[PDB]
Amino acid sequence: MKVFNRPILFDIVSRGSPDGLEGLLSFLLTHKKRLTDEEFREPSTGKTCLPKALLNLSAGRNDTIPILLDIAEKTGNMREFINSPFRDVYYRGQTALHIAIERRCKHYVELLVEKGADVHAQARGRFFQPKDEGGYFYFGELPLSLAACTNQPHIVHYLTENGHKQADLRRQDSRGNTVLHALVAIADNTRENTKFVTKMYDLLLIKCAKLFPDTNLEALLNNDGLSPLMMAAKTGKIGIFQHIIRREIADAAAH
C-alpha cells in the first residue's frame, strides 16, 4: 500500500503531520521493519524520527509524537525507539528525553518517561583537543541534572516523584558529579543565576534528606575527590559557595 522511507518519514515528522502517518504501522509490520532500523535513522547522527519530531514544534506541539510512540509499541520496539541515542559535535548518547527537557516540553517529558525513557541516560561531552577543551555546555549529563541546570523545578519534581520511573537524586555522571556538582558547574556568579541555582540546590538537598535520612547529598564526592562545596571554592563560584556555607551554619543552628 502506502510506502514509507526515510525522506518520506522525516518530511512528515518535520512538518508535524499526524495524518501523514496513516498506513505506517501496517507498512512496518508487513515489511518487518522498525523505526529504529538504520534505514529510518539519520546516518550522520543516529537520530530516529523521534528527535526530529521534538526539534520541530508548532506552538510547542508535534502531533506525530504520540502516534510514533504507539507505532513503536505495536511493533515490539517501544523501549529501543524511545532510548535510541544520537550524537552531534558536542555530545554523544543524547536521547529524546534530553531534547524534550532542553526544549522545556513538560508534557512530552512525561509522555516519554511514562512509556519507558531511560531517566539516567548520559549525554557525554565530545572533545577534539588532547585535553578536554570544554567546547560543549556541561550540565552533568543526566536528565535530572539537565532539568535542574535549566531551571525547571516542575520537571525536577516530575522526574523524581512520578509513579512510573524516578530519576535518582544521588546519581553521579561520568565525572562523578551529582546534580549538586552540576549546579555548581553551571554557576556563573550573576544575580539571576545565583538565585535559581541556590533555590534548586536546596530543593534537591532537602528532598534527598527526606527520602534518605541517612544520606547527605552534598557529602558525595566527584572523581576529583571534591564535594560540591569544595568544587565551588576551587572554581570560583562565590555566590553558591557562600550560600552553602550560610545554609550549613543555619542547619546547625536549627539543632
Ligand X SMILES: O=P(O)(O)O[C@@H]1[C@H](O)[C@H](O)[C@@H](OP(=O)(O)O)[C@H](OP(=O)(O)O)[C@H]1O
Residue 201 binds ligand X (CB under 6 A) = no
Number of residues that bind ligand X (CB under 6 A): 7
CB of 207 closer than 8 Å to CB of 160: yes
Burial of 25 (0-12, 13-18, 19+ CB in 10 A): middle
Phi, psi of 58 (to 5 degrees): -120, 115
Q: Is 18 annotated as a binding residue?
A: no
Name 108's Cβ contacts closer than 8 Å, sequence gap at least 6.
54, 65, 100
The one among 16, 18, 46, 153 contacting ligand X by CB under 6 A:
153
Task: Please check if 157 is assigned to a binding site.
Answer: no
Question: Which residue's CB is nearer to ligand X, number 138 or number 196?
Answer: 196
Of 2, 61, 154, 164, which lies in the binding site for ligand X, with binding defined by CB under 6 A? 154
Contact 117, 146 (CB under 8 A): no
- Please tell me whether residue 40 binds ligand X under the rule CB under 6 A: no
Closest to ligand X by CB, 24 vs 155, is: 155
Which residue from 120, 113, 8, 1 is spatially nearest to 64, judged by alpha carbons? 8
- Amino acid identity, residue 213? P
Site for ligand X in 123-152 (CB under 6 A): 151-152
Is 166 marked as a binding-site residue? no
Tell me whether residue 47 is annotated as binding: yes
DSSP string of 138-182, one letter each residue: -S-SSHHHHHHHTT-HHHHHHHHH-SS----TT---TTS--HHHH
Q: Does 104 bind ligand X (CB under 6 A)?
A: yes
Choice between 159 and 220, CB closer to ligand X: 159
Nearest CB to ligand X, comparing residues 18 and 153: 153
Tell whether residue 170 is among the known ligand binding residues: no
Return binding residues.
47, 52, 56, 91-94, 103-106, 151-154, 199
Q: What is the binding site for ligand X (CB under 6 A)?
A: 104, 151-155, 196
